[PDB]
């Protein structure tokens, strides 16, 4: 947990508005896309096996 302290120290206007967006925006858009593809296929393979 020591380096994440220092990444909020060394560059304050280079990645603090940037890195905390870019690996969390591109996480949450992949998380939004993949929470519905898995789930809608989950209900289908329950129904189509019935």
């Amino acid at each position: 947990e020591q380096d994440g302290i220092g990444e909020e120290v060394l560059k304050m206007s280079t990645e603090e508005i940037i890195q905390r967006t870019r690996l969390l925006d591109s996480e949450i858009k992949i998380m939004k896309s993949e929470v519905l593809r898995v789930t809608h296929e989950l209900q289908a393979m329950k129904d189509k096996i019935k």
Binding site: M31, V38, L42, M45, K48, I49
Partner: peptide, 15 residues
Amino acid sequence: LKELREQLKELTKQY
């Protein structure tokens, strides 16, 4: 989310 992947994968092979 990866637990739902394993539940769907076992469901897929049974399907």
